């Protein structure tokens, strides 16, 4: 076996506790190199003559080039030292510990997870595990109050083509009026983009953190929205823009007026007063040269305190969590303290960071509960929309991404198809509803938390920002109701099958040729197999089905009963058809 490809570390995503006395450990090796991975462990202060505990690590998955082995160590002492025993296809074996590799156990040394502190057990809100989030971009969802529309508001139509500066009049009253629609859809939480006072249509350039934007409503209206959503089983998640403020933020206004004399100059990153010759801003902003968004010095204890007060204030209004804007650009300490603040105020308040790349550094348990899973989106785009990758590659990307973070984070990752910053998924699919639906079937059944971008459920399309922010289509005749019912059915199923919300995931079948992909969600004895025929042709496949897991399944989408013969299951799928096979347990 290639030792150069074997890896483990007693931290991060390769070793972390799932309870005060249980440690999950993982190990990767070149794919196919290891057939058996066992862990020999004991208390860190155990005498050398003491017997060692054994734990067999099962193969939790395989990506492009590695196999991932996973085991659970029972550590009643909460302190553990361990070594791996790896066996190859031909029986060759080697011990692997902190010191290195050796045929002699003691020479391999031992990895050590010093101590398991209860406070360090990554814990997320239970509800977040089985939730289906719906993203609402307020200026474009529903205009329930035409009297607060910004000046220049354009007419609400299906052929509307917005510009970066357009306004359509969407507001919070509109959201309230449409709660029956969201409730019928079955969503259990709403993620709102910024709703605080701001002169723009997107509101990411904050004028006042303590006020609902006038064109969206007021405090009383927001509170009514929170209460009405809650009674309909719908939670509220607000967008926290803590990386940067708007040029109209009171502290910045003071800087523009008093220059180096303002008491708030250190709340920002300023280079040379006068505060501005704007084309070449003399203060750091979000991205490049964006005068409206001066970056906040969150490292400044004063800035932090102010923002923490803002969070406290809104949480006092009954919200259920936060989506953190450009979260990877404010400091880690700020986030560790934020989590402590948030969880101390509401143990069930959800913290979701907005990071598009590998966010493992923020997902170890001391900061965010989850992140907007843009890498999940990349795989889905690649496999279902563009067809850049085949089923086996798709399987590998999914598995590799899943192994990047501890299971607690993976379990609640926000799996979106698109957002207000991308083109709509339908468009990515080139208008092919068949491709779109199979992707949605995957979104609704894969491991993680589904996030729906407003309008996708009724067939809206659009290029990226600002075209992805077209006013919501409310005319029934203009809505794709067939799609709407499809979403409704998938959402009801997700709520009915515990496997889909609290189960693990294992690849079932992956054939690069037929481009058919299948996985199994498991919890207890329940198994739900999802089969995806991502091809424009009718195909038949043979899936392996050991009788120990059942020999009869019910396709929950059609009611058809399928049966396995001698450990094999023959399925025939129409083009782009997906099946959700429940094993009746
Ligand atoms: O620039 C002139 C413009 O300035 C103001 O408006 C700016 C911008 O403000 C708003 O954008 C917000 C998003 O809506 C949020 O979701 C979020 O998105 C950021 C994200 O947090 C960043 O990490 C980054 O994303 C990168 C990603 O990190 C990277 O891995 C890779 O995937 O590329 C991503 C970019 O696609 O940028 C996101 C914003 O993207 C947009 O802005 C970029 C900067 O110019 C641009 O390159 C990109 O094409 C855009 O899609 O955080 C931002 C917070 O600002 C608002 O919704 C946007 O519509 C606005 O453009 C003024 O208000 C505006 O009048 C003026 O025209
Ligand atoms: Ca309005």
Swiss-Prot record:
It catalyses: Hydrolysis of pullulan to panose (6-alpha-D-glucosylmaltose). The keyword Metal-binding applies. Substrate binds at residues 244, 323, 420-421, 465, 469. The keyword Magnesium does not apply. Ca(2+) binds at residues 143, 145, 148-149, 169, 171. It holds the Pfam family Alpha-amylase. It comes from Thermoactinomyces vulgaris. One of its GO terms (biological process) is carbohydrate metabolic process. Belongs to the glycosyl hydrolase 13 family. Keywords: Calcium, Carbohydrate metabolism, Glycosidase, Hydrolase, Metal-binding. The lineage of its organism: Bacteria, Bacillati, Bacillota, Bacilli, Bacillales. Its EC number is 3.2.1.135. Hydrolyzes pullulan efficiently but only a small amount of starch. Endohydrolysis of 1,4-alpha-glucosidic linkages in pullulan to form panose. Also cleaves (1-6)-alpha-glucosidic linkages to form maltotriose. The record marks 421 as: Transition state stabilizer. The active site is at 325 (nucleophile), 354 (proton donor). This is Neopullulanase 2. Its cofactor is Ca(2+). SMART domains: Aamy (SM00642). Binds 1 Ca(2+) ion per subunit. InterPro entries: Glyco_hydro_13_cat_dom, Glyco_hydro_13_lg-like_dom, Glyco_hydro_b, Glycoside_hydrolase_SF, Ig-like_fold, Ig_E-set, Malt_amylase-like_C, O16G_dom_2. Transmembrane segments: none annotated. One of its GO terms (molecular function) is neopullulanase activity.
